[PDB]
Structure 1
């Protein structure tokens, strides 16, 4: 029972009165969840393969440098603002782990 409908149309919460129910979650909706089997593989390959040239330019510019430039440059490569934000956040993690470890 998420929300109760008012019972008259043309309103903030319009609808027809009915008894809504909660239903079991379908397996098709588990697409994006992380798995411990795929996190293990993706971590090992990153160690073997290394980084890419465009990441190496951002990661250097992200530390001791501008932050607006790190997002203007990231958007121009990846192509969209949403992906640029996530990539900058992810690269910020690796530098935090690197220097602060030892």
Structure 2
């Protein structure tokens, strides 16, 4: 509508209120190994180690409630499988 000269704004410190911090990633990874897995996470990991990815995604979706949360959990457990094989 009306013409005004747009400004470039100062970078918001509230932007990315999640974590790009390496220390929180370190703490999250260490706790995962120390604590272990949930029973449903162990079932998903035993399906993923057998190559049954479709069943794993359906089980995760059923027990989490969203396809995005299921995808994120399946990627996390696949990453855990990858580092476990690398350590093996």
Using structure 2 for the length normalisation, give the TM-score: 0.85
Root-mean-square deviation (Å): 1.6
Higher relative contact order (CA 8 A, sep 6+): 2
Q: What number of residue pairs does the alignment pair up?
A: 88
Larger CA Rg, structure 1 vs 2: 1
Runs of 4+ in 1 over 6 A off after TM superposition: none
Partner deviation per Cα, 1:24-74 (whole Å, 9 max, x = no partner): 111112301232332232222222211110000000101223221111110
Q: Give the secondary-structure state (helix, strand or coil) at the position aligned to 1:38.
A: helix
Long gaps (5+) in structure 2: none
Quick check: which one's helix share is greater?
Answer: 2
Q: 1:45 to 1:33 in 2, by over 3 A?
A: closer
- Provide TM-score, normalisation by structure 1: 0.75
Could you tell me which runs of 5 or more consecutive residues in structure 1 were left unpaired when the two chains were aligned: 1-14
